[PDB]
């Protein structure tokens, strides 16, 4: 069936690696592990050996997006579908696969410009994870890391590629007027991916989302940011579609982190809807001075 | 056993009756009914014919606090216990009982100065209640109206009277330094009553609490206040003891209304604890310019 | 603890015995058994050998009301309480107890004039009951036969006697204006007994209630009455207090039978309420030509 | 509260010890352990070190009936109640208590003539019990060994003593005509004790009952008896009161063993009833040639 | 009812404070907090501000045992019972109560020589606890800290005092031959206290027990001890009575810590039993060279 | 769909047949039945007439591995897939099928050299199984006998054959460094088959696994081995992948038996992972003197 099961892992690029190394543990409550051999910050959020890398770079960027598949055959088969649509599929070397803490992966570049990695056999270590501060941990498992929201030059081209080629299913859309956002799922998590287009020629990422196991973690996280002078860009609130109670934290790279609890789950009787608003309540924009997103190209 | 079961109803006194008449429906989402014959605003929150009165008066005040008991015998018996401790017990006339929409009640005055009414056979009308705006209604039943927090001159005198005479059970205490608050229960609701003492000679009320059936009602209520220029005195947050996700709204009388969701319930294996803080997160004081409480006497 | 557990059985008196013999089976769906030696119609509704008698008499009357108690000691002890209040307690002979299909009973007369029988060890025959027509049977067990509603000259005298002496607990009251009805319980069944007073000097019964296991039995029963020319005095509807979906059937004796489904159950967190109406919906009076109740004395 | 909790253990006396030693294991599926020092057969049915003794004797007899109580104080207190009613209470020696595999016991003789032992701290050995043949084990725990049915000269004298003194509660009665049987409970097991009176001057026991965990064990047990020439005195069937699917096996002592599955459990809403029959179905008397009961005295 | 609810907290005395400070966090997985003003190590295991103290001293000793009660009245009332039996009851000063992180406590000395503290209103801080290593935390709540096993000169004197005066209930006994151990409960936890007597004139403690939320924590804890050269005195195994899967760790004071998972819970249908063995399996004595217990007096 | 459902049965070859005959019953707790006509030991573990054979032979060997399929058509169809890949498929004679206590089977030889039997209609006898010692029996049903772990010359050749031809699904891998193990499933049991390669030219088996219904059976089994001088080669512990609490017992043939409780179950949302370790805790190698595996060829 060669389907993407979940988001497996994520690679960020930033000059502000030392600031992210602290941010991940002190604010988000991820577990620091040792750096890569090249000086990237590395984090865990569950039994996986590593789900997030922050690599040194000249600009802020999405280095790579890791997706989970059952095994080699499913990643190969999906690869073939992608290859037929244009992008070159490349099998990772054994030494490359191990750097990503996976049994293996095929990778390719989006028509848009983002690197995706079709992985399997993610390395796990049971009962060794502990958060960077006293919070109740994260909701992963079958729903994976969480989700990422990307900004694309051409919403139809991008939308068609993610659905028709990569095989994501439409969750719902927000059409308020300013923005039109497409939400995609590959499991019970309301979305593993979403896309918007601020305008032509623009590429970037708005946020990644982590789910915590308690609402008090979301509230505490906001208070931790107020205490340690980390920008909260969006007050605690609830989205119209995913129904998740969340805040947005501004990271040392301009990418934001949605810190959320209690998302509505995708069921077999799930019908996509259209919303004219982003939020039911809250999500007040607290820092509109800051850059609205993490822009890669203009 | 002559025990208080729940808080049945509440009587407020204010000059700002017309402002409260609107506030109750437009902000809190109570159902307006017709005024009393004397021009008091009257509200429902469930199947009870009336749980809140706002009577005209020269100053802001707690007119009366209605408590629920099984029947006449239980209210009489509790009455006798109270009478032995000092306060005069008076049986309401039939016409008085009907004004309160109850079968009957005995009333008395606290040593402190608050009027309490031991009632039974509250008038109810099934399947006729609808909120003042689209919210999911209130959690009452065996837990009653909610709770009230009073300010008293002498915390030991007050505490002893509520527990030893009126027969409330201690839930827990907050001792941060500024304040020491006692929480009392008579059912599964974390507290139906709480008391604090800002200083000697002072009497007043801080807030009443209403429980709603959804967290989105709490969030929406805040946004409604921002929209209609009603002061929110405390941001969405969670108390250390009751664990309820709530905001505080400043009413046309200086009394505040805690609008909350999902309180921890009192069980048979419940042990009282001491807390050094009021809130786990949130509950940021947004309007410290306003009067801190509803003061009756200095 | 000597408490009444449920209503065990019922004795009706009527000249129209042959009409009742048919009515019980053809309309209510009770099981006919053989007559007493004296020509009374006898019915079952569950595993009990006999719960209803219809004895020959000159007028319509309540012959006796059977109550259930754990054993001899509990009936004796309750007897002593009653005896102290005025009524003579008499132990039934063995041959009398057997006519009632019970191990034994003490009996007495109400101050009002009704005969009550404190019984125990009711005769049962498992897996031999089948209804008089294809309906889903009756809800009895711990809730017993059902309930009876009596009319009394003096509501306070009657009320005080049933609660303070016989040890019934108040369920709720209806005070519309025309009538004031008291509802009493001794188990999970909303009420086993209720009383009203049309005026001074009047004694009678309005109805007995049977609970069926399906709503379709209530609906079918109405249609059976329309088919066989039996008066339905009250259309399908729902009471404000007991919340039961029911119709009232006019019996060959002027006593009515409430045929109902899905009554709200008395819990340990049960507070009595006051209602200003009898019904939430339905219960339209279809035959106000007929006598309003079964009057015994004027 | 000094109540009997369950039947703990049982002592039988018979000349046919070797026949019982085999019978217990091969037919009933009890676990043989080593004999007492004096040559009694000893069996387990659960984690208890020993629940049944078969002692050598000249005639068939009930040697002793062990009852379970919480501790020494409860057995002493019940002892005092018994002592006041006539029977001498004797504390067992340490060496006697150990022979019974209990921490200690007080014993006394019934007015009727049966020895009862009020015990506590029964010796148990976890996870070492295995049946004498492949059956699904026995239902004990809070319901204990099972029950015994005794025959008494004077049913009122016996009944009064078991209920008013030993503190058993009436479960129900069977009054067919031939026999009148009283059933008593001290826990969820429908009965732990029952009594009947064939005539004056007669004392004996009819049967003991063991509960198995599967109906197939009851059926298999019958077929085992047919195979090994052990008399089945009553075919598989179901009692009117206890509702248990059971057969009766004739033991090497004339005492019968009811081998049963799926008894109706005593609840807090349990009302005693009267039955005119012993069985709903089955329980066909297969061997009326054999002695009807185990008679001790005439 | 003035009953002890649970074990609240514990005070150990040892010269080896620095070794315990590390041991508590690195081996047991408790959370270190700041020392007392006098240099005692302090630990949390749940939301309580502090449940364990390790005070400096010349010898190894049990400094004090904290018990939980509902409030002041219950501790006072139990106090009065104790006072009548001999020991002096002393109310703690406010400053003393705060050192113990409780609202208040009465204390007294056992006839044996152990200090017990009847406390209430334990200080708690929600959602701030994190273990000293990645384990799944501890099972406390209504079952409290866990349990302690003391060694006493005179088992009857001690037993009588704990049950008849302090109001503990007997759980069960182990009588193998070498030892006779009494187990006492005051809640669902199989035991909060147990006592044994190696011989006359001897007083001490064998172990305290902590319950963890996963079996893997017990297994990991053993492997942590093997890694860091901490003596495991008893291999993973299961007790006959409490059924808990546990190991024993030898602490820097000679007191052992039972590290256990999945204890059988005390129910309302709980009967005390007698066992002839301590363990079903495991609990192999790995270090019989070490002192068998923590002896205070000879 | 022609899929393998479970492992049905197993055939071992050893010179030490008499030692295995005892070992199976006394240590593992299997039920002995009569030998084959040729003197093989035969065992049951559930309602199946026979799941394990130990045949006489000159060396230690895996005689045959029985797999379960729905019927003849599914075994034939899978046969055809296998036949196409190289191995000859042979239908068993009726007399051969009966020796295996199955309705019929096709058999073939692995490219590696192991004999596999595709069977159906396994002979069962309900309610006749009892363990060789007092343990709580085995978990089989839809998960079958358990699993076997084989050693192969060429891991890719073997892996490809089991997955692509026999139609097993990958469960997970352990890659520590010394070994790389592949785990395969065909049902809810974490694995029914696993393979490793010590080096080129080597063929053998490490262990078979039996699941018991209680953890105490695993613990008791270890203690039984210590008592009866049977080598335990691996202490109680928990694997990283299957999460089963188990010990390894060294059998009279060099094959080991994993005796385990409480394996994690394969779900529809199951993603294969990679582990860098075999065990979370325990599984200490107690007898490294013994041969590491059962080697068939070098
Ligand atoms: Fe998002
Ligand atoms: Fe409040
Ligand atoms: Fe009615
Ligand atoms: Fe019986
Ligand atoms: Fe212990
Ligand atoms: Fe294995």
Numbering used by the authors:
A (entry chain A), B (entry chain A), C (entry chain A), D (entry chain A), E (entry chain A), F (entry chain A): -1 to 296
Can you provide the manuscript's text about this entry?
We successfully isolated novel 2,3-dihydroxybiphenyl 1,2-dioxygenase (BphC-SD3) and catechol 2,3-dioxygenase (C23O-RW1). Among them, catechol dioxygenases are well studied in the bacterial world. They are iron-containing dioxygenases that oxidise catechol or its derivatives and play a central role in the degradation of benzoate and its derivatives. Based on the position of cleavage, dioxygenases are further classified into intradiol dioxygenases, with cleavage between the hydroxylated carbon atoms (ortho-cleavage), and extradiol dioxygenases, with cleavage at the carbon-carbon bond adjacent to hydroxyl groups (meta-cleavage). Interestingly, BphC-SD3 retained its activity even for months when stored at 4°C. This was an exciting observation as most of the extradiol dioxygenases (EDOs) reported earlier are highly susceptible to oxygen inactivation.
The crystal structure of BphC-SD3 was determined at 2.6-Å resolution, revealing a two-domain architecture, i.e., N-terminal and C-terminal domains, with the sequential arrangement of βαβββ in each domain, characteristic of Fe-dependent class II type I extradiol dioxygenases. The crystal belonged to the I422 space group, and there was one molecule in the asymmetric unit. The monomer is composed of topologically similar domains, i.e., an N-terminal domain (residues Met1 to Thr138) and a C-terminal domain (Gly139 to Asn296), including a 12-residue-long C-terminal tail. Apart from two classical βαβββ motifs in each N- and C-terminal domain, BphC-SD3 has three extra β-strands (β17 to β19) in the extended C-terminal tail. The enzyme BphC-SD3 is a dimer of tetramers. Two layers of tetragonally arranged subunits are rotated ∼45° relative to each other. The octamer is a compact globular molecule having a central pore with maximum and minimum diameters of 43 Å and 19 Å, respectively. There is a 12-residue extension present at the C terminus of BphC-SD3 which adopts the β-sheet conformation. This C-terminal β-strand is present at the opening of the active site and is not involved in any intersubunit interactions. Unlike BphC, BphC-SD3 is active in the presence of oxygen, and the iron Fe(III) center is tetradentate pyramidal, with a His145 axial ligand and three basal ligands (His205, Glu256, and a water molecule). The requirement of Ca2+ or Fe3+ probably explains the oxygen insensitivity of BphC-SD3.
